[PDB]
Amino acid sequence: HSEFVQPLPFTLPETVPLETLQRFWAHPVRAFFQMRLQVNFRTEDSEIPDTEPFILEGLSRYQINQQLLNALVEQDDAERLFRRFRAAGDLPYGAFGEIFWETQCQEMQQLADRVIACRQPGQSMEIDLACNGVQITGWLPQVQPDGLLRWRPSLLSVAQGMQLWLEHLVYCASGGNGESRLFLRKDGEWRFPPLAAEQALHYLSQLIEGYREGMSAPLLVLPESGGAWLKTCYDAQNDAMLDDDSTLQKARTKFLQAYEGNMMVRGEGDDIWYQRLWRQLTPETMEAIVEQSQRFLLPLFRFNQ
């Protein structure tokens, strides 16, 4: 069996939308599979459970938290949404659904006290950019004069930081002097300061080069494990990467922790897109992923504050 990675001919088109870049930098291996060769591994949907939901975990809990955060960002009645979710049966019966709604309302109110502390009314604006002879057309929703404001009921992850960094690059390139902020759970915050037009266009050209590199060859840029390796190796005080053996062992420990998780958290390596390329994580491909993450994910932790 020959290797799946092969140099393919690919010509970069004139008009590349922002949605294509967002779908690329959300998952680069999936974007190499389902868009270049159009191979999307469609797994079958989950079967109907045999009993009523006694607890809330997974996609249903995330959707409940998302609707509760979208309701509390406008200071709406949480009790009406409680009756709406209880009338659909998505909540546990009786008092346990009330306890779940109370602790989720406490957590979403704690998040909303940080979200609407610096919230201004902003409208969606248009994006028309010309970078390296490539046209980027798109729309940015809820653009406030303070900058970019996004909120999601999730954990501190590198993929959301990459998405916020891409939105900040596509926002600062056409006017828009201001910071970009994203508020996650457990006091997690992604912040990017405003930059000049030259640095924003240079980093946007770097992301465009990464996009045109990911369509020819599978761009082995792991967001979570590569970001963990980088933030173990990066030093924000001196703006330089350490090269001692202790940091090189702790970064390998963080990479093995984020790639293959424990028996309670699904790791990044347990995915249908990564098992097709390699069956076992070789150290050569590990060093390749490390080099690609050092090449691409470095302005994520360089401009983080």
Partner 1 sequence: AETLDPLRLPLQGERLIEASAGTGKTFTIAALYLRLLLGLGGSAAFPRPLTVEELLVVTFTEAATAELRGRIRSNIHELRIACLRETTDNPLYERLLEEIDDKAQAAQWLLLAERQMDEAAVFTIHGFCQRMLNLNAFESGMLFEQQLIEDESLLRYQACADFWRRHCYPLPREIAQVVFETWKGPQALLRDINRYLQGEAPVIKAPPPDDETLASRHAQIVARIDTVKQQWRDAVGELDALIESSGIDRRKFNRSNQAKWIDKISAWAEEETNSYQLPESLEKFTPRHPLFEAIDQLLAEPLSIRDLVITRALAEIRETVAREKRRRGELGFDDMLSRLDSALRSESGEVLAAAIRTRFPVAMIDEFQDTDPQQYRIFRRIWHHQPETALLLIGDPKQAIYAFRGADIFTYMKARSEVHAHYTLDTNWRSAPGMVNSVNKLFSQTDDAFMFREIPFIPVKSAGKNQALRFVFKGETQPAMKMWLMEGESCGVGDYQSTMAQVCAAQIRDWLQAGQRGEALLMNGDDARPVRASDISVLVRSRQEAAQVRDALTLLEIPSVYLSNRDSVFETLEAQEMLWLLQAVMTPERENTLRSALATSMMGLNALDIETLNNDEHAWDVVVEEFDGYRQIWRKRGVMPMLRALMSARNIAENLLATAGGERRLTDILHISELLQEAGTQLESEHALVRWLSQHILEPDSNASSQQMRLESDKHLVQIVTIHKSKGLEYPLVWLPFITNFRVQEQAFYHDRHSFEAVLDLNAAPESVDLAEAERLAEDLRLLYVALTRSVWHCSLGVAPLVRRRGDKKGDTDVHQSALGRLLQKGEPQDAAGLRTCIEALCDDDIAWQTAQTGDNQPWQVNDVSTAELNAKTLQRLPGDNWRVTSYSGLQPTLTPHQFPRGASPGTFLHSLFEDLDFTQPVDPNWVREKLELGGFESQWEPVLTEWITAVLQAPLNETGVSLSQLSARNKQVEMEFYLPISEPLIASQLDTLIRQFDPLSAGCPPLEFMQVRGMLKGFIDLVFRHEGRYYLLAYKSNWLGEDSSAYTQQAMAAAMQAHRYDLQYQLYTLALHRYLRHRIADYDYEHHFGGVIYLFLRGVDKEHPQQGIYTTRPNAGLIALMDEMFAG
Partner DNA sequence: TTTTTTTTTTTTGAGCGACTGCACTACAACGTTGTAGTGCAGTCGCTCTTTTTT
Q: Is 74 exposed, middle or buried (0-12, 13-18, 19+ CB in 10 A)?
A: exposed
Q: Does 80 bind DNA (CB under 7 A)?
A: no
Secondary structure element (H or E) that encloses residue 166, with its range: helix 158-172
Q: Point out which span in 42-50, 60-68, 138-146, 289-297 binds partner 1 (CB under 8 A).
A: 42-50
Give the nearer residue to partner 1 in terms of CB position, either 92 or 176.
Answer: 92
Q: Does 295 bind DNA (CB under 7 A)?
A: no
Q: Which of the residues 157 through 176 are near partner 1 (CB under 8 A)?
A: none
The CA distances from residue 210 to 28, 292, 295, in Å, are 10, 10, 10
- How many residues of this chain interact with partner 1, rule: CB under 8 A? 37
Which of partner 1, DNA, none does 153 bind, CB closer than 5 to 8 A by kind? DNA
Q: Does 84 bind DNA (CB under 7 A)?
A: no
Give the nearer residue to partner 1 in terms of CB position, either 40 or 132.
Answer: 40
Give the nearer residue to partner 1 in terms of CB position, either 97 or 176.
Answer: 97
**Residue type, position 119, single letter:** R
Which of partner 1, DNA, none does 93 bind, CB closer than 5 to 8 A by kind? partner 1
Q: Does 186 bind partner 1 (CB under 8 A)?
A: no
Give the nearer residue to partner 1 in terms of CB position, either 62 or 274.
Answer: 274
Q: Does 99 bind partner 1 (CB under 8 A)?
A: yes
Transcribe 37-93 into DSSP letters.
S-----PPPPPPPSS---S--SHHHHHHHHHHHHHHTTT--HHHHHHHHHHTT-SPS
Contact 241, 233 (CB under 8 A): yes
Can you give the binding site for partner 1, defined by CB under 8 A?
1-6, 8, 33, 36-44, 46-47, 50-51, 54-55, 92-96, 98-99, 218, 263, 272, 275-276, 279-280
